[PDB]
Design a binder for this molecule. Structure first.
Ligand SMILES: CCCCCCCCCCCCCCCCCC(=O)OC[C@H](COP(=O)([O-])OCC(O)COP(=O)([O-])OC[C@@H](COC(=O)CCCCCCCCCCCCCCCCC)OC(=O)CCCCCCCCCCCCCCCCC)OC(=O)CCCCCCCCCCCCCCCCC
Ligand SMILES: CCCCCCCCCCCCCCCCCC(=O)OC[C@H](COP(=O)([O-])OCC(O)COP(=O)([O-])OC[C@@H](COC(=O)CCCCCCCCCCCCCCCCC)OC(=O)CCCCCCCCCCCCCCCCC)OC(=O)CCCCCCCCCCCCCCCCC
Ligand SMILES: CCCCCCCCCCCCCCCCCC(=O)OC[C@H](COP(=O)([O-])OCC(O)COP(=O)([O-])OC[C@@H](COC(=O)CCCCCCCCCCCCCCCCC)OC(=O)CCCCCCCCCCCCCCCCC)OC(=O)CCCCCCCCCCCCCCCCC
Ligand SMILES: CCCCCCCCCCCCCCCCCC(=O)OC[C@H](COP(=O)([O-])OCC[N+](C)(C)C)OC(=O)CCCCCCCCCCCCCCCCC
Ligand SMILES: CCCCCCCCCCCCCCCCCC(=O)OC[C@H](COP(=O)([O-])OCC[N+](C)(C)C)OC(=O)CCCCCCCCCCCCCCCCC
Ligand SMILES: COC1=C(OC)C(=O)C(C/C=C(\C)CC/C=C(\C)CC/C=C(/C)CC/C=C(\C)CC/C=C(/C)CC/C=C(\C)CC/C=C(\C)CCC=C(C)C)=C(C)C1=O
Ligand code: HEC
Ligand code: HEM
Ligand code: HEM
Ligand code: FES
Lengths: 86, 64, 426, 245, 295, 58
């Protein structure tokens, strides 16, 4: 009888909508240490008057986005058709 | 043809045949007892030097 | 040629068949079977490479497309390519384990000379073939390897008069260079089989699984009693390698070393020089080049490593004078009040502890050298890894210097104990 | 069983895991040469495995010999299975693999062709003859001498549609591949002019140097001659499965 | 020996430090049916991936090394694939090597045997049409940070904004998954862009997932053959485990049996002198010692 | 006592090895991926096509 009855709820994906936009905000809080580090790095770079061209607020941002996406991507992929549902 | 197919196998228990013979007397007495010190020193030194190299790399990449 | 006295064995089919049907092998362990594994991997490399040669068109602009298309339309071609790559990996692993095992047993004696050098030469040739094989991939890795080899070749001639053209035409991979290098690769790969046969015949003169002289006189008949064990040990090591590769390498991976093989010569012009890395077996030499930014010194280091690896029996051997050779010593002369020192005699393997300590320091230094890429982008601007320099220098010292091998301390201490005991007991 | 044997072997008195003699043992062969004398005090043997390593089956030793042979056979069979996989790989590499058969289906309308006419069509990049035979023509072809015919194995395939049988054959000469004459007054069949090979109206080999009839073209007629399905004959090619699952 | 995990180099592989490469493999685990234990490609997923590739992203990219007929058993049937691919045209200028086989002198409908060329004749034409940056060829694209995930991440990672100190030139877009986080590709996946034949909802994550599955399927080592080869590895490993005991019986027990020898030494005191020991012995390498050693 | 018969026996043992190591893994592998076959996708597409065809306009 399973899978032969109606589905009670429809997700964003089941309606053809993109859920990553909201899921980014959902997963933002837990990656807060890296966000704070990135903010401090940006503040310091803004303060500097003669900054070496090598310096960049890129690697801290790389770590922050890595931590955000590590949570964002698997959650969305698990809801997609074609993959064994979690 | 008149001898055991697998002679002197598991005589005693696992402890005597495996834990005490194949590990303490064959692996440690013969192999580990010879290289535990040099291998440990080299492994620790390599770990420390690689950590220092990575910390210098971090200082290069990351400021603030 | 009166200087050449003759050959140890006449490699004729009749005599080879008789010798291998009457051969006897003493009881041994797995550690003394890396040579058989190397030979079997060589045989499989020959077979798989012959299968691959019928697919590879030596034109650079067709090799990638030909490889991609012939893996689908033809069955087992990609299987043979994978077998060839993994055979190269396992061949390097077995060869280096064999080298370490033979260094451990102190096989630099005179009676081992013919056994030792004939092996090293094979190893040396085994290097060249591998290099040529890389060139056949026609990727950016092949481009960089060819460029480095051409620069090294041109180093000897001080960059004069394009002496490299007969092989490395323009120092670039093109139709002529690819054709020549592929044919040379095939021919030298098949020559390696004969070199290995000669080495295997030579080494049986004095073969020992362990340094200690077991008194056993009975021995196994090679054809099946020893061959079955050799095949089984090969199976066991292959199982272990499969387990280690399965767990250490997840199915999808991030930042592998194969990512530099994306670029195909001709199709992609720009090269991502940020991530340049060869296969792990040639990793130590690229690491040495990065660590030693001086071109001539790096080339000299490579040549010295290989050639001192070849001439171990001469520097560290008895030298036919029965340990009456006199070394040259820097500081011990002041302590002993003698200009030279007689070579020490008691340098056993299993018993003494200094030999084991030094050998395992050397082995761990080699492993650390192959452990990673120095990443020359700022490896020198940032004070480089001191461990890499220490390991390289210890590799150089261990191979060539006889104070780390056959040390005098053991002999002097043993003689001191002998003198004291004899005086006490008269 | 296995548990019983393990229990039996558990209670074994041995020195640090090795079954060795606890006392010196000396054995002298009573029938040794007269010049050997007594055994020397040297203790050559530390183990008595010559006697301990014994299953006392001096009766029916051939059974244990057969068992050892069987174990050897199992080991060799595993090794030979691996070698057979390798040999399959090699030979399959040498002998190509036709993963799938490319499409060759086609359709040509023959109804428009007037009866007793031969038309050339381009199928699979090759010329092909399409002909219509009347009842009188077929009857005339039959009853002719069989001496001229030079193909006992070859036959003729005639369609049944459109009120007149339709024939489709390969328009390639068997001798060397030249295009034969389409129509001749003596016999409205095929007669090659490059060397004089003579065929009949059924494409048979009558009084001609060519030793083979014109190859037939696989076809099936439907829609009463409007839809002549033409697909190249399919031959087996194995292995056919490309994916296990 | 120990590699720091915050440098930006995974397991010590330096380089790729201006990219986000650990997402989906090391930090986070995106599920792909192909790489799961005893897994395999989802036929529907690769089918939809080819549908989206053909209806979009085939207008800039291509797989010169690959051809459509790879999709003949797990993604499409011969007739269906032929009908789908007959919607595109190839000029002879597309061909990498005509070799006298391609006799056409004008555009013609593609067949399943044709290689997957982009609409442009050459790389320079595509580079000129796309603002001077060449849409990379997807054949052999497996060799990217993250592997199969690389296609999925880039197609989706257009949400973040550049930090301070980074300038995105006009015509360029910020995407942290690309080299140096600047990419010349405008975002292509939009909800409802492609109407799947099976009715599956067309959301950008779903389209990215299908595209990634198809692109991976078209590879050679990590592509359509990896699952069967992994099953073959499992079977061979089982065979080795089963054969180990028989190897032991053949080799080690047999050697132990051969060493069950009884030795005896007696005292021979007859008049005979041991002259054979004093005058005897042969050395196979004597020719190397004669005239050279101990003279 | 008949060497070629014993060789046939060895061939049989190798055949048993191959089948033992082959059949179970293949069976479990193709049982695990039953729902990922092309037939499932074809059935889903056919159902969707039928549903779309029945409900439409002129
Ligand atoms: C890092 C990782 C972690 C660490 C890793 C560590 C790794 C460690 C590796 C260690 C390797 C070395 C191991 C050494 C073991 C030594 C054992 C020992 O002491 O033996 C001595 C012993 C005799 O020594 P002895 O000292 O002379 O004896 C003294 C006695 O007092 C007097 O002796 P005797 O004269 O009485 O005996 C003479 C002997 C002489 O007899 C022979 O030589 C005849 C041998 C005939 C072999 C026939 C093989 C048939 C294979 C196919 C079977 C069908 C498969 C169906 C599969 C699908 C099922 C649904 O006959 C016997 O003893 C008869 C016993 C056998 C009965 C018949 C069954 C034989 C086959 C059993 C195995 C196959 C099971 C299949 C699965 C079943 C369901 C679970 O030797 C034997 O008898 C050996 C018999 C053969 C054993 C083979 C075992 C293979 C197992 C494979 C299957 C595994 C489980 C299932 C897996 C399923 C999924 C794939
Ligand atoms: C256009 C067409 C052209 C023609 C094409 C056809 C060409 C035909 C070539 C025929 C060659 C005849 C060779 C005669 C000797 C063969 C062995 C023998 O005596 O047999 C009795 C033997 C009787 O059974 P047994 O009582 O159990 O004894 C087994 C032992 O082998 C019994 O051995 P053992 O323990 O008593 O002692 C073995 C050995 C003691 O051990 C050794 O010393 C071994 C050899 C050491 C040196 C070589 C090392 C490498 C080992 C040999 C190479 C093996 C790999 C070959 C790979 C080839 C390429 C793939 O002692 C000897 O026998 C000394 C002589 C060894 C043979 C060499 C001298 C005679 C033959 C060659 C003379 C001419 C010179 C050669 C160049 C000629 C050029 C024209 O017969 C068998 O067991 C045959 C079993 C066959 C079935 C199992 C394997 C099937 C393959 C499975 C893989 C998948 C493919 C399936 C097959 C597909 C269809 C083919
Ligand atoms: C369709 C095929 C039809 C053909 C026949 C198929 C069956 C053939 C079975 C052949 C025997 C296989 C097992 C023994 C192999 C060695 C053979 C041998 O040398 O025998 C000759 C000989 C015995 O002379 P024999 O009396 O003439 O031969 C009798 C036969 O061998 C027969 O002996 P047995 O009948 O007494 O065998 C009993 C055994 C076999 O009986 C069976 O065949 C039944 C197996 C059923 C398996 C089912 C699995 C699940 C799948 C089915 C699920 C659905 C059904 C559920 C039903 C539920 C019902 C409530 O049943 C057991 O499972 C009990 C064994 C004790 C428990 C051990 C637990 C595992 C410990 C592993 C430790 C490993 C440590 C390594 C690392 C150490 C260092 C750290 O052996 C010796 O003398 C060796 C003694 C020295 C070594 C002792 C080592 C003991 C510890 C290790 C044991 C390793 C094996 C464990 C097997 C576990 C089950 C797979
Ligand atoms: C040391 C050797 C390996 C370690 C373990 C020890 C193995 C030896 C012990 C005895 C084992 C006996 C039983 C083995 C049965 C295996 C069956 C199997 O998987 O093949 C079925 C299949 C049968 O295929 P099939 O006919 O069902 O279908 C083929 C078509 N496809 C691919 C679409 C399914 O075998 C093959 O066809 C494979 C041929 C390969 C030829 C070229 C060699 C490639 C490498 C193969 C081995 C890879 C593993 C690692 C090898 C390392 C050493 C080189
Ligand atoms: C040089 C000494 C031997 C070297 C051994 C290594 C392999 C050498 C292979 C090349 C030489 C082959 C010579 C014989 C030619 C016939 C080959 C053949 O099987 O026919 C294929 C042919 C062609 O296969 P096919 O028709 O499926 O493929 C061709 C057509 N396509 C590509 C469309 C699929 O198949 C047959 O018709 C054979 C049917 C009979 C099968 C039994 C043959 C027995 C005699 C040959 C046995 C060879 C065993 C070799 C074992 C080696 C072990 C290491
Ligand atoms: C410095 O420059 C140089 C180089 O490059 C740098 C060089 O490479 C070299 C060396 C290299 C070369 C000269 C090139 C050589 C290249 C080589 C060896 C590569 C090929 C290697 C191989 C192992 C090829 C193996 C090939 C095969 C197995 C193909 C098998 C094919 C066939 C047909 C086998 C069956 C047929 C036969 C045996 C013929 C017998 C007769 C028949 C069958 C008759 C049939 C007909 C009838 C009517 C019956 C030199 C010297 C050099 O100076
Ligand atoms: C034309 C408008 C394009 C469409 C349609 C698609 N892509 Fe593309 N892509 C395009 C350009 C001009 C570039 C180069 C960007 C640069 O800065 O170099 C790219 C690049 C990619 C990449 C990266 C390739 C690399 O070597 O790193 C990927 C992974 C990629 N594009 C994927 C992709 C996907 C999934 C598309 C939809 C299926 C797609 N592209 C469409 C231009 C165009
Ligand atoms: C001991 C013997 C051999 C060794 C050590 C060896 C080494 C190598 C190596 C290292 C590669 C590159 C692999 C890679 O980059 O991943 C290679 C490729 C290649 N080898 Fe060999 N090889 C040997 C024998 C042979 C033989 C005998 C032939 C031909 C008869 C051959 C033909 C080839 C071909 C064609 C390639 C390239 C295949 C491709 O690019 O698709 N090899 N070899
Ligand atoms: C492809 C390269 C090589 C092959 C194919 C090969 C092959 C073999 C084989 C089969 C054996 C017998 C088995 C064994 O002793 O383990 C052996 C032994 C030996 N090898 Fe090699 N070998 C190679 C490389 C080397 C190297 C690099 C050295 C030394 C630098 C070397 C020196 C020796 C020596 C001295 C022995 C005899 C050991 C002894 O007498 O105890 N070989 N070789
Ligand atoms: S060409 Fe037709 S008969 Fe000679």
């Amino acid at each position: 009888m399973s899978n032969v009855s109606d589905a009670q709820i429809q997700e964003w994906i089941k309606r053809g909508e993109d859920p990553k936009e909201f899921l980014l905000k959902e997963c933002a809080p837990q990656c807060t240490a890296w966000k704070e580090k990135l903010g401090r790095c940006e503040a310091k770079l803004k303060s500097l008057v003669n900054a070496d061209p090598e310096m960049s607020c890129m690697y801290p941002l790389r770590d922050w986005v890595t931590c955000i996406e590590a949570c964002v991507q698997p959650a969305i992929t698990r809801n997609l058709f074609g993959s064994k549902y979690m | 043809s008149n001898q055991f197919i697998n002679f002197h196998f598991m005589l005693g228990g696992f402890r005597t045949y495996v834990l005490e013979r194949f590990f303490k007397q064959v692996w440690y007495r013969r192999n580990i007892r010879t290289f535990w010190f040099p291998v440990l020193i080299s492994y620790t030194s390599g770990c420390i030097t690689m950590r220092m190299y990575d910390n210098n790399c971090y200082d290069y990449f990351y400021f603030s | 040629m009166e200087w050449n006295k003759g050959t140890y064995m006449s490699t004729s089919i009749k005599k080879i068949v008789q010798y291998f049907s009457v051969m006897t092998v003493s009881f041994h362990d797995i550690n003394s079977l890396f040579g058989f594994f190397t030979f079997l991997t060589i045989a499989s490399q020959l077979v798989s490479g012959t299968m691959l040669a019928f697919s590879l068109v030596p034109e650079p602009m067709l090799i990638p497309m030909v490889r991609e298309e012939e893996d689908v339309e033809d069955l087992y071609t990609d299987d043979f390519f994978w077998l060839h790559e993994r055979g190269v990996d396992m061949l390097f692993i077995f060869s280096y384990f064999h080298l370490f095992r033979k260094i451990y047993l102190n096989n630099f004696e005179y009676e081992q000379e013919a056994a030792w050098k004939s092996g090293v030469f094979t190893f040396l040739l085994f290097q060249v073939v591998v290099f040529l094989g890389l060139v056949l991939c026609c990727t950016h890795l092949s481009d960089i390897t060819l460029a480095i080899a051409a620069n090294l070749y041109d180093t000897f001639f001080a960059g004069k008069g394009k002496f490299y053209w007969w092989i490395f035409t323009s120092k670039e991979l093109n139709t002529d260079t690819i054709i020549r290098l592929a044919y040379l690769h095939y021919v030298l790969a098949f020559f390696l089989a004969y070199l290995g046969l000669i080495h295997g015949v030579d080494m049986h003169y004095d073969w020992k699984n362990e340094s200690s002289m077991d008194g056993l006189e009975t021995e196994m008949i090679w054809f099946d009693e020893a061959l079955s064990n050799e095949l089984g040990a090969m199976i066991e090591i292959i199982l272990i390698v499969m387990i280690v590769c399965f767990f250490m390498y997840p199915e999808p991976e991030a930042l592998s070393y194969e990512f530099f093989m994306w670029g195909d010569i001709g199709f992609i012009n720009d090269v991502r020089f940020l991530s340049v890395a060869p296969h792990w077996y040639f990793r130590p030499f690229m690491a040495w080049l990065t660590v030693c930014p001086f071109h001539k010194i790096g080339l000299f280091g490579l040549i010295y490593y290989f050639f001192i690896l070849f001439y171990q029996p001469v520097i560290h051997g008895t030298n036919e004078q029965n340990n009456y050779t006199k070394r040259n010593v820097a500081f011990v002369s002041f302590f002993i009040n003698r200009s030279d020192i007689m070579t020490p005699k008691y340098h056993s393997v299993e018993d003494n502890l200094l030999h084991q300590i030094t050998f395992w320091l050397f082995l761990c230094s080699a492993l650390y050298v192959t452990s990673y890429l120095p990443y020359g982008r700022f490896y020198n601007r940032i004070n480089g890894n001191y461990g890499t320099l220490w390991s390289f220098m210890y590799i150089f010292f261990y191979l060539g210097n006889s104070f780390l091998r056959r040390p005098l301390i053991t002999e002097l201490y043993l003689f001191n104990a002998f003198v004291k005991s004899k005086f006490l007991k008269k | 069983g296995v548990l019983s044997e393990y229990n039996q072997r558990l209670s074994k008195k041995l020195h640090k895991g090795h079954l060795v003699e606890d006392k010196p043992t000396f054995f002298v062969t009573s029938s040794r040469p007269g010049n050997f004398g007594d055994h020397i005090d040297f203790k050559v043997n530390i183990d008595n495995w010559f006697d301990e390593n014994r299953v006392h089956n001096e009766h029916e030793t051939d059974i244990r010999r057969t068992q050892i042979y069987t174990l050897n056979a199992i080991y060799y069979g595993g090794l030979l299975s691996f070698a057979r996989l390798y040999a399959m790989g090699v030979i399959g590499r040498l002998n190509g693999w036709k993963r799938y058969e490319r499409d060759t289906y086609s359709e040509v309308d023959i109804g428009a062709l007037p009866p007793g006419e031969v038309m050339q069509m381009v199928w699979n990049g090759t010329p092909i003859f399409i002909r219509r035979l009347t009842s009188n023509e077929v009857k005339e072809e039959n009853e002719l001498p069989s001496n001229t015919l030079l193909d006992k194995d070859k036959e003729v395939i005639l369609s049944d549609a459109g009120n007149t049988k339709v024939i489709v054959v390969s328009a390639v000469c068997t001798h060397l591949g030249c295009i034969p004459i389409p129509y001749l007054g003596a016999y409205k069949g095929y007669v090659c002019i490059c060397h004089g090979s003579v065929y009949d109206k059924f494409a048979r080999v009558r009084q001609g140097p060519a030793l083979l009839n014109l190859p037939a073209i696989n076809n099936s007629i439907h829609d009463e001659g409007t839809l002549v399905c033409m697909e190249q004959l399919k031959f087996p090619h194995e292995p056919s499965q490309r994916f296990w699952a | 020996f120990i590699y720091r995990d915050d440098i930006g180099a995974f397991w010590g592989i330096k380089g790729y430090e201006e990219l986000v490469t650990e997402v989906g493999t090391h930090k986070g685990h995106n599920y792909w049916p192909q790489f799961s234990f005893l897994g395999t490609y989802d036929s529907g997923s690769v089918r939809r991936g080819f549908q989206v590739f053909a209806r979009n992203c085939g207008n800039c990219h291509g797989m010169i090394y690959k051809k459509y007929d790879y999709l003949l058993d797990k993604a499409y049937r011969q007739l269906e694939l032929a009908q789908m691919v007959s919607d595109f045209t190839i000029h002879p200028a597309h061909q990498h090597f005509k070799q006298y086989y391609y006799q056409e002198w004008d555009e013609r409908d593609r067949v399943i045997c044709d290689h997957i060329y982009p609409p442009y004749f050459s790389q320079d034409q595509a580079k000129n049409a796309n603002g001077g940056v060449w849409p990379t060829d997807f054949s052999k694209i497996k060799l990217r940070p993250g592997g199969i995930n690389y296609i999925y991440n880039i197609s989706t990672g257009y949400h973040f904004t550049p930090p301070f100190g980074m300038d995105v030139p006009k015509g360029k877009y910020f995407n942290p998954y690309f080299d140096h986080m600047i990419i010349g590709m405008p975002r292509q996946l939009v909800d409802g862009l492609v109407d799947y034949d099976d009715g599956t909802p067309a959301s950008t994550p779903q389209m990215a997932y299908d595209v990634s599955n198809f692109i991976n399927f078209m590879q050679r080592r990590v592509g359509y053959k990896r699952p069967d080869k992994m099953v073959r590895y499992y079977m061979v490993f089982t065979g080795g485990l089963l054969i180990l005991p028989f190897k032991y019986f053949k080799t080690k027990a047999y050697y132990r049996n051969l060493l069950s020898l009884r030795w005896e030494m007696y005292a021979v005191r007859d008049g005979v002198y041991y002259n054979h020991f004093k005058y005897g012995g042969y050395n196979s390498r004597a020719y190397q010692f004669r005239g050279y050693f101990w003279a | 006592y008949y060497p070629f018969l014993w060789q046939f026996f060895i061939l049989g043992t190798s055949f048993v090895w191959f089948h033992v190591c082959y059949d179970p893994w293949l069976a479990i592998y193709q049982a695990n991926n039953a729902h990922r076959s092309l037939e499932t996708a074809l059935t889903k597409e056919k159902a969707h096509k039928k549903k779309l065809a029945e409900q439409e306009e002129s």
